[PDB]
Amino acid sequence: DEFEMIKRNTSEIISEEELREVLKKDEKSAIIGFEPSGKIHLGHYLQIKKMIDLQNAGFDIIILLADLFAYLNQKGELDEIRKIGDYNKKVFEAMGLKAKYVYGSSFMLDKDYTLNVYRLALKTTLKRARRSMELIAREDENPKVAEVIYPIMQVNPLHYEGVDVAVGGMEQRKIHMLARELLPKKVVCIHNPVLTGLDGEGKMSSSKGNFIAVDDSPEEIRAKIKKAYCPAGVVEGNPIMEIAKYFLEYPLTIKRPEKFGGDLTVNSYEELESLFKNKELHPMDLKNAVAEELIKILEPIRKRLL
Numbered sequence: 447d448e449f450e451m452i453k454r455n456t457s458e459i460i461s462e463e464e465l466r467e468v469l470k471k472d473e474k475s476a477i478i479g480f481e482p483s484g485k486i487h488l489g490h491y492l493q494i495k496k497m498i499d500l501q502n503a504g505f506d507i508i509i510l511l512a513d514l515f516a517y518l519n520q521k522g523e524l525d526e527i528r529k530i531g532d533y534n535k536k537v538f539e540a541m542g543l544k545a546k547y548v549y550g551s552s553f554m555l556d557k558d559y560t561l562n563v564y565r566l567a568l569k570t571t572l573k574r575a576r577r578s579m580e581l582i583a584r585e586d587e588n589p590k591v592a593e594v595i596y597p598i599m600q601v602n603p604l605h606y607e608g609v610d611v612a613v614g615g616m617e618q619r620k621i622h623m624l625a626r627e628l629l630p631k632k633v634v635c636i637h638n639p640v641l642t643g644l645d646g647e648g649k650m651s652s653s654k655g656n657f658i659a660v661d662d663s664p665e666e667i668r669a670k671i672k673k674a675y676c677p678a679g680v681v682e683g684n685p686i687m688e689i690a691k692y693f694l695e696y697p698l699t700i701k702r703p704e705k706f707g708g709d710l711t712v713n714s715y716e717e718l719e720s721l722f723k724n725k726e727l728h729p730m731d732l733k734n735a736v737a738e739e740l741i742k743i744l745e746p747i748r749k750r751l752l
């Protein structure tokens with residue numbers, strides 16, 4: 447079912463009724479924004495996969511290369527950000543996304559865009575702006591005014607003109623709660639789960655070096671997964687299990703030595719989850735399988751990038 451495939455592997459949809467209205471329409475578009483990133487990782491990929499779901503469901507897809515956002519979030523200088531953006535677009539194309547790419551700066555410095563920023567800046571408390579940004583804002587001992595401008599730009603109605611659906615990570619939900627209240631026309635939010643970093647420590651992220659990047663070499667993927675936090679029995683906050691859930695194809699045929707049970711054919715992730723949880727599946731065999739299926743999943747993307 448179409449709704450159910452869009453919903454597969456999301457954390458929430460605001461709201462599912464509105465989404466149902468959206469899907470009946472002949473024409474619908476879904477946006478996502480990304481601060482240009484030095485490395486594109488499985489956190490990026492999960493979300494582009496969701497956009498590919500939407501595209502399969504007939505949506506026109508818009509990718510905002512959120513360059514001014516990144517500028518405000520201290521990712522550096524704008525033309526240098528825009529060249530990272532340009533690379534991100536190649537990466538996204540190599541994932542098989544069919545989309546229109548927009549650079550934020552091409553319209554975000556327009557007079558109407560800027561007046562909406564100041565209009566919204568009158569309606570938005572500093573306390574709320576700062577709360578919305580707690581998971582987004584670059585680490586800063588002395589937070590900058592830039593921090594609170596960022597979420598009000600993110601809620602600006604000009605980003606969403608003729609857009610039915612916005613997709614983002616659950617780390618975006620407080621900014622989206624703001625836009626829910628303050629956008630003149632409602633946009634459905636589709637929020638994706640945040641992937642745990644390989645060390646189990648916090649979330650996967652470009653600046654935390656705890657990610658597998660989609661163009662990692664096979665041995666690099668192998669070594670990254672070997673090291674990964676993956677306690678026997680434990681599923682919650684286990685990033686190897688997360689990768690099995692969000693990226694793998696089922697049925698999944700786990701190769702093992704007969705000394706360790708021999709080949710294991712798992713028909714669903716929930717099946718994999720119980721086998722791992724009661725312990726018929728060791729970390730090391732999950733890892734080899736995850737690493738090997740992840741390598742196969744990534745390799746056309748690495749190939750195109752190389």
Ligand SMILES: N[C@@H](Cc1ccc(C2(C(F)(F)F)NN2)cc1)C(=O)O
Binds near residue numbers: 481599618
């Ligand atoms: N805050 C996001 C980046 C981001 C920038 C801009 C938007 C958006 C967009 F329209 F959805 F793209 N409203 N502008 C949505 C997300 C991040 O953390 O990368």
